[PDB]
Each structure stands twice: as structure tokens, then as C-alpha cells.
Design a binder for these strands. Structure first.
Ligand SMILES: O=c1ccn([C@H]2C[C@H](O)[C@@H](COP(=O)(O)NP(=O)(O)OP(=O)(O)O)O2)c(=O)[nH]1
Ligand SMILES: [Cl-]
Ligand SMILES: [Cl-]
Ligand SMILES: [Cl-]
Ligand SMILES: [Cl-]
Ligand SMILES: [Mg+2]
Ligand SMILES: [Mg+2]
Ligand code: NA
Ligand code: NA
Length: 326
DNA sequence: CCGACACCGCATCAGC
DNA sequence: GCTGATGCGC
DNA sequence: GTCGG
């Protein structure tokens, strides 16, 4: 974190634009700048120097000059003192409470943890769980704990059916020493892009994990995507581990590489790679990579047999997972 | 100047 | 119920 | 807020 000060500033700005301004593009603009600056191998000495990086424009260059000279940014100093912005930024920290619901709760006089807790009845299911585990969800997950969780998940999966293949992706697959959550990509020979020869494929797994008390709560659940809560078991007299967020994504086995590519991220890396794909005349999603015919309409899926093939299609040299943390 | 900005599953609600 | 818009987290 | 045509 050579430029931690600047990147934090940019991230706060991005959060403000998303949560308060509800200006998604400025949000992504600030996040891109923060990312490009985060990988810059030099301690930035001026805005001009920063403005040379792609994604850093004139406005951010000036803010960087202000921050470098004063150690702060007036724009953020004001934002922080604004009660409405503070309330909204706080509420959005609760899983399930987005920019809209946050501003809505503020209008109704619900702007603090105390308020949320006493108005549980005004929350949807997801928001309730998010509130319940507010503290825990803010904690990082040590890779050590991620290894224990991977062990439980893969083994429980094998017990349901030896043909399931569960791969932990997200930041974990990228080599991170700590993760915000656990993301599991699941595949089974019965479910391909050609047919679903077996229903409840995801349900079976969720069920087994709850049965052994690994999964404790459910934020949302469908045929191919599960979003919930899990907790490592603790030993006798040992204090309980914090509850953790867990995402499970069931993907057609023949589309594993596009799925593993997507679920490995980062989200910014995917945004960059997907944008570059478009510029190269292709469209990439978690299922396939297809060409972009003149009409702008996507064509038929191109053959893929490894993550590298996807990279080849867009003329990008392969990048190992640990090098996709943008 | 200015249109484009990655792409999608599940939850919830309004209209028919 | 079916469908489409919108929110929220991927 | 930034960038490409
Ligand atoms: O907007 C998004 C979010 C996530 N993703 C993909 C990439 C990301 O790595 C993966 C899992 O999402 P998480 O929110 O779990 N992020 P990640 O695992 O990278 O980091 P973290 O340690 O915070 O969970 O889903 C996107 O493509 N777009
Ligand atoms: Cl500041
Ligand atoms: Cl694939
Ligand atoms: Cl597709
Ligand atoms: Cl996902
Ligand atoms: Mg993750
Ligand atoms: Mg996740
Ligand atoms: Na730039
Ligand atoms: Na939130």
C-alpha cells in the first residue's frame, strides 16, 4: 500500500457516489482509478503523475494534489459532517440495505443500529440476517479458517454425491491471506448447458451443509445461486468463530472455465476483461464467450477448454489468479 | 462533444 | 399467476 | 468521472 492514502480517499469517494449520490458510474470510475493506482509501483508524488494512468482523469488528479499537499480532501471532510450522508453510508453497511432502502429508512427516522434493531419488523428477510450478523460480517476471514471451511464444504459435498466438484473461488483462489467471504463454484455431470437430468442439485448440497450445522442462515436461494451464512464448529470451552457469508454458484459442467474465470474475479478484473472483450468484438459472461456480429447481437458460444482459451480469444496473455486482484 | 460504461440470479412489488 | 421494472449483491 | 472516436 504505497499509495494507501490516495486509494482510501478514492474508495470513500466511490462509496459516497454509490450510496448517497446513487451515481453508479462515478462509483465505478472512482473504483477503477483506485485500482489502477493501487497497482502502480511508485509512491505517487503528484496528480500529474497519477493522471498518466488510465482511469485517472483531471478531477481526480486535482484531488490527488489536494490530498498530497494537505493530507485530506475538503470534499470528504464536508461529506463526513453531513448527517444524511453519514446515516445512509452507515445503513448500507448492513447486508441487504442498499442505497435506496437506506435513504428510505432515513426518511422514516431509522438511522442507527439501535433504530434498526427496534424496527426489525420493517426489514425483509435478508436485511434481518444482515442486521443479526452486522458485527461478524465486517470481520475478515483468515486464510487458515478458509482452509478449514473448504475442507468441510468439499467433504460434505462428496458425501452427497462423489460426482459433485466444488471449487473455492473469489479472493481465496486468488491467493488472498484473508477473505470477505467464501465463494463456492459447484458442478455436477447431471447439469450441463444441454440438460438438467437431476433437479435439487443445489438444494441437496445446501441441505447437507445445514444438516451438519455448517450453514446457519439463508439470505436468498434459487436453482443455481445460494447466498447464506456459515460458521466453523468450535472445540470445547472455545469461543465461537464469527458467522461468515457464503455464496454457492451451481454452473453447467461443460461451462466450468467461464464459470471459474468469473467466480475468481476480481470484480474489477472482470469489468476490465469484459470491457476489453467487447472492444475485441466479444462478450463474456460466466457461461460463455461469444462473438459480436455487426448487428451488435451476440453470436454462438465459442469452444473453451481452459481459462487461457478465453484469454486467447481477446488477445490477452494469461494471468494467474493471484494476478487478477484489481 | 458524448454515448458507453460487464453481466446476471434472486427477492419484491406493481400492473394486468 | 405471469411478466417486467427495480433493488441488491455477484 | 473518464475515455475513445
Ligand atoms: O460485481 C461483482 C461482484 C463479484 N463478481 C465476481 C468476481 C468476484 O471475485 C466473485 C465473488 O464476489 P465477492 O463479492 O465474494 N468478491 P471476492 O471474493 O473477490 O472478494 P471478497 O474477499 O471480498 O469476497 O464474483 C463479479 O463479477 N461482479
Ligand atoms: Cl479526507
Ligand atoms: Cl467454459
Ligand atoms: Cl450465455
Ligand atoms: Cl454469483
Ligand atoms: Mg468472495
Ligand atoms: Mg461472495
Ligand atoms: Na489518465
Ligand atoms: Na448493504
Amino acid at each position: 500500500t504505497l499509495n494507501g492514502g490516495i486509494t482510501d480517499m478514492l474508495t470513500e469517494l466511490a462509496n459516497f457516489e454509490k450510496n448517497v449520490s446513487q451515481a453508479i458510474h462515478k462509483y465505478n470510475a472512482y473504483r477503477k482509478a483506485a485500482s489502477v493506482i493501487a497497482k502502480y509501483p511508485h509512491k505517487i508524488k503528484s496528480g500529474a503523475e497519477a493522471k498518466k494512468l488510465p482511469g485517472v482523469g483531471t478531477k481526480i488528479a486535482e484531488k490527488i494534489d489536494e490530498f498530497l499537499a494537505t493530507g485530506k480532501l475538503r470534499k470528504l471532510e464536508k461529506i463526513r459532517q453531513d448527517d444524511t450522508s453519514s446515516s445512509i453510508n452507515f445503513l448500507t453497511r448492513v447486508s441487504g440495505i442498499g442505497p435506496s432502502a437506506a435513504r428510505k429508512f432515513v426518511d422514516e427516522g431509522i438511522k442507527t443500529l439501535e433504530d434498526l434493531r427496534k424496527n426489525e419488523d420493517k426489514l425483509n428477510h435478508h436485511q434481518r440476517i444482515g442486521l443479526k450478523y452486522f458485527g461478524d460480517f465486517e470481520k475478515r476471514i483468515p486464510r487458515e479458517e478458509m482452509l478449514q471451511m473448504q475442507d468441510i464444504v468439499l467433504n460434505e459435498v462428496k458425501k452427497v454425491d462423489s460426482e459433485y466438484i466444488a471449487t473455492v473461488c473469489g479472493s481465496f483462489r486468488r491467493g488472498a491471506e484473508s477473505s470477505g467471504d467464501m465463494d463456492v463454484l459447484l458442478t455436477h455431470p447431471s447439469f450441463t448447458s444441454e440438460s438438467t437430468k437431476q433437479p435439487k442439485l443445489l438444494h441437496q448440497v445446501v441441505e447437507q451443509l445445514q444438516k451438519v450445522h455448517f450453514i446457519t442462515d439463508t439470505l436468498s436461494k434459487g436453482e443455481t445461486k445460494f447466498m447464506g451464512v456459515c460458521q466453523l464448529p468450535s472445540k470445547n470451552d472455545e469461543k465461537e468463530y464469527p458467522h461468515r457469508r457464503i455464496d454457492i454458484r451451481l454452473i453447467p459442467k461443460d461451462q466450468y472455465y467461464c464459470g471459474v474465470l468469473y467466480f475468481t474475479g476480481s470484480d474489477i478484473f472482470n469489468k476490465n476483461m469484459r470491457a476489453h472483450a467487447l472492444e475485441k468484438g466479444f462478450t463474456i459472461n460466466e457461461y460463455t464467450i461469444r462473438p459480436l456480429g455487426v448487428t451488435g447481437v451476440a453470436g454462438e458460444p465459442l469452444p473453451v477448454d481452459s481459462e487461457k482459451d478465453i484469454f486467447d480469444y481477446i488477445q490477452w496473455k494469461y494471468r494467474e489468479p493471484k494476478d487478477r486482484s484489481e
